[PDB]
Each structure stands twice: as structure tokens, then as C-alpha cells.
């Protein structure tokens, strides 16, 4: 077909298909694999505290995206809030849920299990300029 | 990092990107990109038309988000909806004229991948290819 077509067609349809899987994955302890990545980010902070401004800076995710998120990770028992003297900070439980998920999907590569390292590899390279211009690996 | 979890956060980041840049090309016309592309698919289609549970087939996503689409294109004239002699979605010619136009204006910006070259779209394609076939988009 047309370049563009074809590579934002296949782009689209890998996230389709490795979002259907993941989000299986982590179902269990009550996320979506967004929600997931947050509380990640959480237990690579200080404290396992962020300000919501600068979860969504890390996760390059819309202000919006992240009230949505932290509240339902509030309501699942695995973050609190707090005003900021608003600051997320994980909980034990959040902690434990997240060290499970993560050993969840680790066991089953996220998705990418028929796939070599190499071709992980490929994958990272090639999408990698991508991301330079959106922000991604800059301060 | 692991590989995996390095591929995986690329492939999101991407689709985020991509989708952020094309949703607002074709936003004038007061589509998402998901509602473009069921415009397409019907332009591809014989007379125009396609069942409901087809068009979810096709686009990979949840009944009740095929709803939402065609619902919203019968919103703006863009799509008529009728039983199936199930339920047929056909692009009208005001739909035909949209995705015309829209199309156009997103073929001249690459679909958001402009910065990169020709050998680079097509390592993206074959790269994700193995992917997609396993899913079944390379068979009947
Ligand atoms: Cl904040
Ligand atoms: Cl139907």
C-alpha cells in the first residue's frame, strides 16, 4: 500500500492486539495496564509519592488521564491522596498488587513471547525517533 | 531494559502519538480517527454497505463501540442505518464527500510519520508483520 498507511495501520493494530493481552493480565487485581503503569512509576519515586502533575509528565498521559486513574486506583485501596503542601502515594497494598501484576506479565514477555530479543530490539530502535520528538527521553 | 517491556511501551507510546496527530486532522469534520475509519472500511465495501457485527469484525473493536461509531456517523448524515434483510450501515454520499476530503488531508501529512523515510515505514510494517499474523489479519 501506501508507507504511512501500511505503518500506522500495524502500529494501531500491534497496540490492539498486546493492549487485549496485557489488560487480561492484570484484570485480576482490578487495572487496566494503564493503571498499571502508574503504579509502577509510583515504586520508582521518592516515598512512593508524585504530584498528579508529574505522574502525567513521566507517563507523557493528559492531566485527565491521570484524575481518572488515581481516583480508581483510590477506590481499589492501592494509592491515597493527599493536598500538596494533590500528591498520589501507593500503598502496601498497591506495592504488593504491583510486584504480582509485574510477575504476571513478565511470565507471559507482555505479550511479545513469539518474538526473539531481537526483534524487541528492532521494535525499540525503530519506534525510537518517534518518541524523541514527542518528549519522551527529555527532561 | 527487558526487551519485551521496552517493545511494549514503544508500540503504545506510538499508537498514543500517532493517534493524538491524525484525531485532530480529522476533527474539522467532526470525526475521530475510529469513525474515519469505518468510513473507509464502507468505501470498500460493496454498495457501500456492511453489516454491524462485520464492521466490528473488522475494526477489532466491542459491539457497543460499533454502536457509538455508527450511531454518531448517522448523527452527521454520513451513514444510514437499516435492518439486514442484524443491522446494515451504508455511507451515504455526504460520507463519501467526508472521507474523501479527510483522507486527502491526512495522506499529505503521512498519517504522522512524515519524519520518517520511506525504508523506515516499511521496516515499521514488516517488523509488526509476524505480530498481525498470529491475530489472523493475514487470512480469511
Ligand atoms: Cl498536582
Ligand atoms: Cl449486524
Redesign the interface.
Known sequence: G???????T??????????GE?DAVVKPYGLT?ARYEALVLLTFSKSGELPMSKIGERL?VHPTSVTNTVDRLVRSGLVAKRPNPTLATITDKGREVVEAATRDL?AM???????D?E??????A??????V??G?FDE
Not at 501506501?2 to 500506522?8: D, H, L, T
Not at 514477555?109 to 518474538?115: C, E, N, R, T, V
Not at 525503530?126 to 518518541?131: A, C, F, G, I, K
Open positions: 501506501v508507507p504511512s498507511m501500511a505503518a500506522i500495524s502500529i494501531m493494530r500491534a497496540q490492539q492486539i498486546l493492549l496485557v495496564f507523557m513478565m514477555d507482555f505479550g511479545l513471547g513469539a518474538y530479543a526483534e524487541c530490539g528492532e521494535i525499540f525503530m519506534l525510537r525517533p518517534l518518541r520528538a514527542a519522551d
